[PDB]
């Protein structure tokens, strides 16, 4: 639910009880298992094939960290925030991070 | 005996001089997510290499091909070589790894886009005792690594080919050996229904089939896997253009099954799922998600109606987390 | 910076004074300036540059919806948007478009 | 005598029966943005129509076409027909409009995308006193809505057909009449340089050309427009794929012009504005727009460099605008 979404959001922004770990350019996002499954079919491709408690994922060099940062908050809040400097790489509203056909 | 030095960051630079201070039997080297040592830092230990068995280094990006050269050149014995996403790893070192120790039995070279074909030929010739195969979205690995790789060592049990550039013309040939248990043909180019039928019927002893993120497979291939897949226990259907009628087909014609993963299917039938709810006897995997086409009666009533279904929606993986 | 100019113009706009170009949507009047809408939406420069009048009155087709329309001007001014998942489709063009919009 | 009843909303539904009681000189009917009166409520006044000249009605969506029938069939004299955003304007109504009142001299039929070709020929055979022609993105306006019009009235001045469905061949034709004053091409398919060459060498008198939002035009057209442009006073170059080099040519080779509009161009230079500032006293277009990267030198130097000028940009307009 909505408050469930917010509670999961805060628990993400506690750095505690995080399942999936996204490794982009040494930077490591820590997020859950179910939410990134809800977000982008590319990730749910690489998760559900494993029941491991701890997971690891890397992303192609094409996907930029600057455009990558807002996407996690997008997934967690279901909210749209954008700036005029950073649009072209997200120009499909299916968020089109480089490769990236869902 | 058990190094397990994973995620040591910048703590191990010269220390390994006393862990193996007198040691002659290190067999559990796992330095995954290493960020401290250098080529010297691996070559100092690689001088002896006493009977290494489970060499492993995930995402050790800074280490070079000279690391693999030294670690494969100094011990003819090896049982697990699961290196990680480490880049700048050419194929010349893998040549020597195949040339020296021709007894390796388990590999993992995902996210190393330098092993397109030559690594396949070199560790396909001499080495034979291989058992598990897993790769990642590594392109330029042409269809030559499949036709030619089922030719030599037929005892392999795990096969991993997600996101590679191999053609179905090699998928034809995987019907050869009957030892294979796991498939990872994610991101492939239209395996036929005839291909799926041949590989299922010949390879009677098959456990897990991946086929994730494949668009071109119709509902019929799934319709017909189950008629002869007996010991198959899980299938991973994601983003496939199925018509959601093979669900009842696999609930009718398949009884030895407990795990099935329906991925990003555009159309999901509710009555077919209702029938599969009581069709089989070994299915409690109701991880309902992306459920825009759902009512509030089945999901409200089966919670207490069936104490054998736990659910794992984002609504569920919060109570369990609160309990701990 | 010129963004100071933009913010000052925005605050002046959000007083219903010094507003030059008036947009009309089924009765709602949304006031704004003359230069900025010319810089933003190519449908608007068409109807603007051809006149030198005092008070302008530009109407928009039914194809453009109000609900997405309010944040359009906001993103024209301060390049910041607020939006949730229910009202996306009539905006999914990522080059603004949404208007005619064959470029 | 002077209605000007625009933006009157729901105050006027039947009260017009009292305005037209002894007054027979209604010329200034103006009910734009009307939202109260209906078919019969406009038909009662259209019953008489004594010598109407300046009929105008913008954005009367609910208005029917029987009203245009009645206003055209009860007074053969008419001079201004500025209708607007009224939708469902049938092409039958224009038929009787142009048949009955054959004196009109000013039109405004924008945003009526069902008058694509017929209305042209209808008031193209008979009507000959027309002076100002104005449309909008009126779809299906073909090239055969163009050539078969300019052979009948040669005294046109304002030609308005922005964003229509026509090709360069029709605009090649308009070189015939030689009194055209202002040109309103938007969204055409490549009016060529030779075509503008002839249309300007033939039509010497020409005040304003738009060419707003043309992507296919080149820099040489404006290069040569100043080679012969004597009376030209304003160019409307927006979203044009220019090399931003015709500006020096028009600043050198043109001696009578005051406005040049370079709008949605991806390149804006400070040196160009500085050169146009003093290169010509008449050519002043330093109204910088969409210029993010700029320092604060202008607001500190041009104050004492130009102390007797109050400027005209949106940047500097801080005195009148507050009032």
From Swiss-Prot, chain A:
Looking at the record, the residues that make up the BTB domain are 18-84
Entry's localization field: Nucleus
Q: How is it modified after translation?
A: Ubiquitinated by the SCF(FBXL17) complex or by the by the SCF(FBXO22) complex, leading to its degradation by the proteasome. Under oxidative stress, reactive oxygen species covalently modify cysteine residues on the bZIP domain of BACH1 and release it from chromatin. If the BTB domain of BACH1 remains intact, its beta1-alpha6 degron is recognized by FBXO22, promoting its ubiquitination and degradation.
Coiled-coil intervals in this record?
Answer: none
Functional summary from the UniProt entry: Transcriptional regulator that acts as a repressor or activator, depending on the context. Binds to NF-E2 DNA binding sites. Plays important roles in coordinating transcription activation and repression by MAFK. Together with MAF, represses the transcription of genes under the control of the NFE2L2 oxidative stress pathway.
Q: Which family does it belong to?
A: Belongs to the bZIP family. CNC subfamily.
Q: What is this protein called?
A: Transcription regulator protein BACH1
Q: Species name for this entry?
A: Homo sapiens (Human)
Q: What is the lineage of its organism?
A: Eukaryota, Metazoa, Chordata, Craniata, Vertebrata
Q: Which residues of the full protein are shown?
A: 17 to 118 of 736
UniProtKB/Swiss-Prot annotation, chain B:
Mutation: residue 265 to R; reported impact is: Impaired ability to bind substrate proteins
Q: Where in the cell is it found?
A: Cytoplasm; Nucleus
Source organism's superkingdom?
Eukaryota
Under the subunit heading, UniProt states: Part of the SCF (SKP1-CUL1-F-box) E3 ubiquitin-protein ligase complex SCF(FBXL17) composed of CUL1, SKP1, RBX1 and FBXL17. Interacts with BTB domain-containing proteins such as KLHL12, BCL6 and BACH1; specifically recognizes and binds a conserved degron of non-consecutive residues present at the interface of BTB dimers of aberrant composition. Interacts with SUFU. Interacts with PRMT1.
User: Function of this protein?
Assistant: Substrate-recognition component of the SCF(FBXL17) E3 ubiquitin ligase complex, a key component of a quality control pathway required to ensure functional dimerization of BTB domain-containing proteins (dimerization quality control, DQC). FBXL17 specifically recognizes and binds a conserved degron of non-consecutive residues present at the interface of BTB dimers of aberrant composition: aberrant BTB dimer are then ubiquitinated by the SCF(FBXL17) complex and degraded by the proteasome.
Which family does this protein fall into? Belongs to the FBXL17 family.
Q: What protein am I looking at?
A: F-box/LRR-repeat protein 17
Q: Which organism is it from?
A: Homo sapiens (Human)
Which residues of the whole protein does the chain here span? 363 to 686 of 701
């Amino acid at each position: 639910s909505t408050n469930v979404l917010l509670s999961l959001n805060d628990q993400r922004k506690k750095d505690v009880l995080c399942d999936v770990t996204i490794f982009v350019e040494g930077q490591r996002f820590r997020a859950h298992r179910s939410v990134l499954a809800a977000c982008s079919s590319y990730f749910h491709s690489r998760i559900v094939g494993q029941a491991d408690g701890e997971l690891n994922i890397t992303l192609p060099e094409e996907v930029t960290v600057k455009g990558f940062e807002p996407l996690i908050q997008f997934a967690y809040t279901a909210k749209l925030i954008l700036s005029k400097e950073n649009v072209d790489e997200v120009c499909k509203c299916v968020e089109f991070l480089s490769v990236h056909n869902i | 005996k058990q190094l397990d030095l994973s995620s040591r960051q910048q703590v191990t630079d010269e220390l390994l001089e006393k862990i193996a201070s007198r040691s002659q039997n290190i067999i559990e080297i796992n330095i995954s997510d290493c960020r401290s040592m250098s080529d010297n830092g691996v070559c100092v230990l690689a001088f002896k290499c006493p009977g290494l068995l489970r060499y492993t280094a995930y995402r050790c990006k800074q280490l070079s091909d000279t690391s693999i050269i030294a670690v494969a050149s100094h011990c003819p014995l090896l049982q697990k070589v699961h290196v990680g996403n480490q880049d700048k790893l050419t194929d010349e070192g893998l040549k020597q790894l195949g040339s020296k120790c021709r007894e390796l039995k388990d590999i993992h070279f995902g996210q190393c886009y330098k092993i397109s074909d030559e690594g396949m030929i070199v560790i396909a010739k001499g080495c034979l005792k291989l058992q598990r195969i897993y790769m990642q979205e590594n392109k330029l690995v042409t269809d030559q690594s499949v036709k030619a790789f089922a030719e030599h060592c037929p005892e392999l049990q795990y096969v991993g080919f997600m996101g590679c550039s191999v053609t179905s013309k090699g998928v034809i040939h995987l019907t050869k050996l009957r030892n294979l248990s796991s498939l990872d043909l994610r991101h492939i180019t239209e395996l036929d229904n005839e291909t799926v039928m041949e590989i299922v019927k010949r390879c009677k002893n098959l456990s897990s089939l991946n086929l994730c993120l494949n668009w071109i497979i119709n509902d019929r291939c799934v319709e017909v896997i189950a008629k002869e897949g007996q010991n198959l226990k899980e299938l991973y259907l994601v983003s496939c253009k199925i018509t959601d009628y093979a669900l009842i087909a696999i609930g009718r014609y398949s009884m030895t099954i407990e795990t099935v993963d329906v991925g990003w299917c555009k159309e999901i039938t509710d009555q077919g799922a209702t029938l599969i709810a009581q069709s089989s006897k070994s299915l409690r995997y109701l991880g309902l998600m992306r459920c825009d086409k759902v009512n509030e009666v089945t999901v409200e009533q089966l919670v207490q109606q069936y104490p054998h279904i736990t659910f794992s929606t984002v609504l569920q993986d919060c109570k369990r987390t609160l309990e701990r």
